[PDB]
Amino acid sequence: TCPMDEKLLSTVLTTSYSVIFIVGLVGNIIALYVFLGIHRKRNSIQIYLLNVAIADLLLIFCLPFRIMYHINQNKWTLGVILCKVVGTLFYMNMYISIILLGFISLDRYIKINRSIQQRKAITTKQSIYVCCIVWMLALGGFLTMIILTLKKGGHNSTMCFHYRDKHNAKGEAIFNFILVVMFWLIFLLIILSYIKIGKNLLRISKRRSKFPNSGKYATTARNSFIVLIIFTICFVPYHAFRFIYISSQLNVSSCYWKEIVHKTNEIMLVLSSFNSCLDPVMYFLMSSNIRKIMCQLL
Numbered sequence: 368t369c370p371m372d373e374k375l376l377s378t379v380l381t382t383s384y385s386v387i388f389i390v391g392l393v394g395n396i397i398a399l400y401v402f403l404g405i406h407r408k409r410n411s412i413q414i415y416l417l418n419v420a421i422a423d424l425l426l427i428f429c430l431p432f433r434i435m436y437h438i439n440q441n442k443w444t445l446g447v448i449l450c451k452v453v454g455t456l457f458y459m460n461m462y463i464s465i466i467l468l469g470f471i472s473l474d475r476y477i478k479i480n481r482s483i484q485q486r487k488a489i490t491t492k493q494s495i496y497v498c499c500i501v502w503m504l505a506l507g508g509f510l511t512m513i514i515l516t517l518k519k520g521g522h523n524s525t526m527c528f529h530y531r532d533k534h535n536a537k538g539e540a541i542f543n544f545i546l547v548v549m550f551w552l553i554f555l556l557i558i559l560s561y562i563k564i565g566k567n568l569l570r571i572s573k574r575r576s577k578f579p580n581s582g583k584y585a586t587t588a589r590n591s592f593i594v595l596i597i598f599t600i601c602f603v604p605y606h607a608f609r610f611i612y613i614s615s616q617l618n619v620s621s622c623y624w625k626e627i628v629h630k631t632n633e634i635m636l637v638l639s640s641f642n643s644c645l646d647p648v649m650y651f652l653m654s655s656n657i658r659k660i661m662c663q664l665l
């Protein structure tokens with residue numbers, strides 16, 4: 368455990384996480400207000416996005432502990448219990464957000480590309496069913512893993528969010544490895560969905576059957592590509608490097624690899640958490656009614 372300099376890393380992480388925290392807080396507050404205050408009725412996609420907003424708001428509420436830890440002296444003043452609570456809660460919220468974004472991709476694909484008329488907008492029932500299942504499965508994993516870590520593991524210290532060996536705890540490592548591959552499957556589904564949606568909207572706009580609103584389809588096709596690219600840049604490099612993280616952490620090696628691996632992991636955490644603040648903004652910007660409201664109000 369080489370105690371290497373991280374003051375510049377601490378400062379850059381503190382600044383990045385503070386900006387992400389404030390932007391995500393304001394964005395998720397606005398998203399909750401619009402999904403509750405002015406949205407009387409919900410469809411499957413809107414319920415999905417409300418749950419994404421709740422997960423992102425929980426990750427944003429998790430962030431201030433991280434910024435305080437990084438800014439104070441890069442040491443954790445409080446107990447290991449809160450360290451474990453925050454560390455597990457941040458990751459569970461992140462993966463809930465990822466899963467629900469994959470479901471938003473999927474139902475957008477089935478609703479736009481292949482649907483002919485409608486499904487009478489009764490897909491909401493299965494939407495809350497899937498949302499409840501995912502939240503219950505996340506909460507169960509949260510409780511079991513935290514209750515195992517607090518008692519079974521004797522590694523209690525005054526340092527948090529740091530690099531640790533997984534010789535004592537290999538279940539956490541294998542569960543993280545499974546999380547990465549399921550995230551990659553979700554990302555492949557997301558990219559397929561959004562490429563197909565964009566191509567369908569471009570061909571529909573290119574046919575130009577009716578002159579009115581023949582240019583909004585091109586805008587919607589562009590928006591699909593934009594949201595797919597934002598998701599990619601936010602999440603892909605992180606889970607690309609998490610493989611090297613696990614490979615280095617599950618075997619004995621010189622700490623010289625460890626500092627650069629830890630620094631890369633933290634930088635990728637910054638990009639991943641930035642999606643939390645970005646997600647509410649894309650809904651407001653890509654919605655024609657909300658965009659016009661923003662344009663006329665400003």
Ligand SMILES: CCOC[C@H](COC(=O)CCc1ccccc1OCc1cccc(Oc2ccccc2)c1)OP(=O)(O)OC[C@H](N)C(=O)O
Pocket residue numbers: 450451453454455456458459462463466501504505506508509510512516527528529530531538539540542543546632636
């Ligand atoms: C105990 C400290 O945890 C935080 C971190 C280590 O994080 C991991 O190894 C990944 C997260 C993880 C993996 C395996 C099991 C539970 C995990 O915690 C989150 C979680 C909870 C519940 C469910 C769940 O998976 C879901 C699956 C399906 C649906 C919804 C959720 C995930 O350690 P630390 O804070 O020290 O940070 C180390 C390092 N800086 C860094 O960033 O990894």
